[PDB]
């Protein structure tokens, strides 16, 4: 059997995007975009929940904790997909 490290309610593993101006800097400059996830999350569970719900090959998943408690995730997509054409569809 292929167990994950922790079973963590995968339709709630992502919470909200970040709409700061530096996030748009990461879109136009990095082909990346910014999500807010819960602390109980992975570079294997978030990375699977982007290539399925969105339909995009994700390059890397750079995560960090934020001292108010919640977790911040810079997800960088592949070169084949612009983050600007996939972020205006959501509302960025």
């Amino acid at each position: 059997l292929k167990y994950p490290r922790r079973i963590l309610d995968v339709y709630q593993i992502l919470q909200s995007p970040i709409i700061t101006e530096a996030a748009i800097k990461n879109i136009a400059d990095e082909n990346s975009l910014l999500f807010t996830v819960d602390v109980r999350a992975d570079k294997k569970m978030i990375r699977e929940a982007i290539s399925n719900f969105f339909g995009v090959k994700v390059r890397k998943v750079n995560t960090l904790i934020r001292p108010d408690g919640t977790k911040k995730a810079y997800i960088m997509l592949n070169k084949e997909y612009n983050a600007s054409e996939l972020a205006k569809k959501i509302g960025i």
Binding site: I65, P67, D68, G69
Partner: protein, 57 residues
């Protein structure tokens, strides 16, 4: 030389191995201390650290 100052910059890992919750729950005496802490009503019955993260504030 130094001063007659007692507490210093010791790591909170070693302060949690002595005054933390595990050595406080590894004895009948220390869990009786937690009977007095929970019986009084202290919001922080130990002074500890965390092996993963620092503080959620």
């Amino acid at each position: 030389a130094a001063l007659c100052l007692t507490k210093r910059s010791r790591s909170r890992k070693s302060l949690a191995r002595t005054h933390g919750f595990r050595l406080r729950m590894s004895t009948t005496s220390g869990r009786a201390l937690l009977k007095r802490r929970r019986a009084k009503g202290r919001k922080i019955l130990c002074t500890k650290t965390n092996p993963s993260s620092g503080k959620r504030a």
